[PDB]
Ligand binder design. Structure first.
Ligand code: ANP
Ligand code: MG
Length: 772
DNA sequence: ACCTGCTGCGGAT
């Protein structure tokens, strides 16, 4: 049993002098990779998955022309960190080679991202590196230019953090780029995927390899986390101060000053800039200084120069704290970071495991992680998150099926340089995972829209007698300036693409002391998943029924600290005192009260996430304007639905038959604000909207105007591929209709209770749903 | 009172 016996003597001798022994994930991965199989490596953050995917390819490059290895990272910071960390093995091979009198190998390593200056991009095409590190977006650019000629020799493709794109149109974008690559090679490259958070393994492996078989490497995972949920104030409902931020910022500086290097994660860029300002202002007042800053920001809007210095000073431990977004969530190996702080509950359990994983990033080390709730109901969010992280209960991922807009974009790009065979392009598309069942009718339908069908611009010419697609002038410049799959989002700061007479684009689509509508806020993308929503209610119900003893025991195995136990107990007690019972996975609560203006307000309490409450609000809305004649559309969130009715009220308003749900949602989604937004993002991603400058993505006000003016014409044609895909994304990717159906099935089974209660003043849970 | 998510981002003249 020798995992290093396969490699040459030099690489074997180096790895022995560098590490005590390979990890199980390395030994298994080297076996599968060396035998030629596509391999998905599933192991915790301290497992050495980088060398698992790289070392065999490195050994072959060391053995006595063109880019040979292609590493793809979803994050730029990780891409640069991999380049720096590959210096240790390459430097070691050289030391060992020369120790034994052999000539040193020359292995080049390059990084191609958006930060690469033009002159360096030209140097990387004239002299391509043996190991190319890049992003999915940039891989798309090289495949849609003369740079692809350097990729004709690629033998290995590493897709790091494959879970981060598997369930998105960004990964479908990546899935097609890789198939376009395989068509540039004599032999499709070997594909290797890495992730500590894979569920289900078989589906992520299907995303990585498409139709090719995948050896799944997933050895027994032992990763120790030291998690903690700290609440600095004794009562979040009655704060001595204007806000909870001052006491939170205090404990963070306390935690940073107590640890060598810490990463503080914020769920937005503005909050990261804010906290960095606060943490420095606190550190200065404590140290009599007006002298390095204690903390510095890292996120997408930071320049590359400042970003580079933050990563370098973090790599060396010079920087004691960095306040980052998800730009540092994955992969980075900062040996000086022994603490990760998460402000607010993270967007998912998997991300919390990835973020906290940055700390203790060595084999066998513990990852220390502290979560700070922002408000009362966020404390439950952080607790459930810590709970699921300790048991590894992450979300189940599902590859979006047949995303036609992603296809249309690649179709312009694959034919931007040459004429492509429609059959061959279809054959390659079906080899990817997201299009394995693509109907040929949908394929030709997409080509028709790109060619011939007038507020849009077609970008290709289709010869059906020959089966050939050719590009119209500027197709390449259109594809390369597209930006990929990530959509242009933006908020109406008052009004842009105005309607005068900050707000969410969807809230805006639904346009002194008089009753007002509550601004609907979609944080970003889909919302809470149904399985995690169930876990939230089961946590709330369980802990709201424990004597203080079992309660305290339960909180301490989550790492509750400060006053987290007091505030959770008080929160559930007060919610119990207000509605008798607390909402849970088995009991929904319908709460009713009258506004100070005399208007009724009926709130549905349920933890099952926005993916279920989104479509449920559509159904309630249809009934409200049909059965009651009220056109005000209800506000939906992760933790329930808010309805407002002028004074004339029941819970049967929310209850529907299981077979009634899916048809209703299908009929209402076409007029909803979500569909208008996702039709715009789809139309732009398909490269069909007219832009203001050929080599520049049109401003958001202009996308909206042209997309809205296009939809008013496309509504007339229900078979329009953009309409089809917009409906496809809303119902399958945003909503979770199967979850909404079984929820109604359970309510019909009398297995999900419902309680009507009238309150004199909003309960704690109702107060939270009202703007906070 | 939390004061309303991120990721990435031309090329050929
Ligand atoms: O060189 C590595 C690094 O310093 C850490 C962890 O290695 P990673 O390659 O970053 O492991 P992961 O990619 O899985 N981390 P994440 O899931 O991306 O977050 O340990 C070093 N290292 C590698 N291999 C070993 C062995 N065998 N022993 C000790 N340290 C090792
Ligand atoms: Mg990794």
């Amino acid at each position: 049993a020798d995992p290093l016996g396969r490699f040459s003597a030099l690489t074997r001798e180096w790895f022995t002098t560098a590490f005590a022994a390979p990890t199980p994930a390395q030994a298994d991965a080297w076996s599968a990779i060396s035998e030629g199989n596509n391999t998905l490596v599933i192991a915790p953050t301290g497992s050495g998955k980088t060398l698992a995917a790289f070392l065999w390819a490195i050994d072959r490059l060391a053995d006595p022309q063109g880019t040979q290895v292609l590493y793809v990272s979803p994050l730029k910071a990780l891409a640069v960190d991999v380049e720096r960390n590959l210096r240790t093995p390459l430097t070691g091979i050289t030391r060992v080679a020369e120790r034994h009198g052999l000539p040193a190998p020359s292995i080049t390593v390059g990084v191609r991202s958006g930060d690469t200056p033009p002159n360096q991009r030209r140097a990387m095409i004239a002299n391509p590196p043996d190991v190319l590190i890049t992003t999915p977006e940039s891989l798309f650019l090289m495949l849609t230019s003369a740079a692809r000629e350097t990729l004709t020799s690629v033998r290995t493709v590493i897709v790091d953090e494959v879970h981060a794109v598997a369930a998105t149109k960004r990964g479908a974008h990546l899935a097609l780029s890789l198939e376009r690559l395989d068509q540039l090679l004599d032999t499709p490259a070997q594909r290797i995927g890495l992730s500590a958070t894979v569920r289900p393994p078989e589906e992520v492996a299907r995303f990585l390899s498409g139709q090719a078989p995948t050896t799944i490497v997933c050895p027994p995972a032992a990763k120790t986390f030291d998690l903690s949920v700290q609440v600095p104030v004794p009562d979040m409902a009655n704060l001595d101060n204007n806000s909870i931020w001052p006491d939170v910022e205090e404990r963070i500086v306390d935690l940073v000053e107590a640890h060598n290097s810490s990463i503080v994660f914020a769920n937005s860029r503005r909050l990261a800039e804010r906290l960095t300002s606060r943490l420095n202002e606190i550190h200065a007042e404590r140290s009599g200084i007006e002298p390095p800053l204690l903390a510095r920001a890292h996120h997408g809007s930071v320049s590359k120069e400042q970003r580079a210095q933050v990563e370098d000073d973090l790599k060396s431990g010079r920087l004691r704290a960095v306040v980052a977004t998800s730009s540092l969530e994955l992969g980075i190996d900062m040996g000086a970071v022994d603490l990760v702080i998460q402000v607010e509950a993270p967007p998912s359990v998997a991300s919390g495991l990835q973020r906290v994983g940055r700390a203790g990033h060595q084999v066998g080390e513990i990852s220390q992680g502290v979560l700070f709730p922002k408000h009362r109901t966020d404390l439950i969010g952080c607790a459930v998150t810590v709970q699921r992280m300790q048991t590894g209960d992450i979300e189940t991922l599902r590859v979006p099926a047949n995303p036609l807009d992603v296809l249309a974009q690649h179709t312009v790009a694959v034919a931007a340089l040459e004429p492509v065979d429609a059959d061959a392009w279809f054959d390659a598309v079906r080899r990817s995972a997201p299009f394995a069942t693509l109907p040929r009718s949908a394929f030709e339908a997409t080509l028709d829209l790109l060619s011939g069908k007038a507020e849009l611009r077609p970008r290709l010419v289709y010869d059906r007698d020959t089966g050939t697609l050719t590009a119209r002038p500027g197709a390449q410049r259109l594809a390369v300036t597209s930006g990929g799959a990530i959509p242009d989002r933006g908020m109406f700061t008052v009004y842009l693409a105005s309607e005068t007479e900050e707000l969410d684009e969807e809230m805006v689509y639904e346009s002194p002391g008089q009753p007002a509508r509550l601004p609907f806020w979609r944080g970003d993308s889909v919302g809470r998943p149904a399985e995690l929503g169930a876990a939230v209610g089961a946590f709330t119900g369980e802990l709201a029924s424990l004597d203080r003893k079992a309660f305290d025991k339960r909180c301490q195995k989550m790492g509750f600290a400060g006053y987290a136990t007091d505030n959770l107990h008080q929160l559930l007690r007060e919610q119990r005192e207000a509605t008798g019972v607390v909402p849970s996975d088995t009991t929904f609560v319908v709460e009713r009260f009258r506004d100070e203006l005399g208007d009724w307000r009926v709130i549905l309490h349920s933890p099952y996430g926005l993916r279920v409450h989104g479509p449920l609000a559509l159904a309630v809305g249809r009934r409200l304007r049909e059965r009651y004649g009220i056109d005000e559309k209800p506000t939906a969130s992760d933790d329930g639905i808010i309805v407002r009715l002028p004074d004339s009220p029941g819970a049967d308003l929310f209850v529907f038959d299981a077979d009634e749900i899916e048809p209703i949602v299908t009929a209402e989604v076409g007029g909803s604000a979500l569909f208008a937004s996702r039709f715009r993002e789809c139309a732009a991603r398909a490269l069909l909207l007219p832009r203001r400058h050929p080599g520049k993505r049109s401003p958001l006000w202009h996308q909206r105007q042209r997309a809205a003016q296009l939809l008013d014409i496309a509504r007339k044609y229900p078979d329009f591929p953009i309409v089809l895909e917009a409906v496809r994304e809303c119902l399958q990717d945003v909503y979770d209709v199967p979850a909404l159906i079984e929820l109604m099935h359970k309510i019909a089974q009398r297995r999900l209770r419902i309680v009507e209660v009238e309150t004199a003043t909003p309960s704690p849970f109702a107060a939270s749903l009202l703007f906070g």
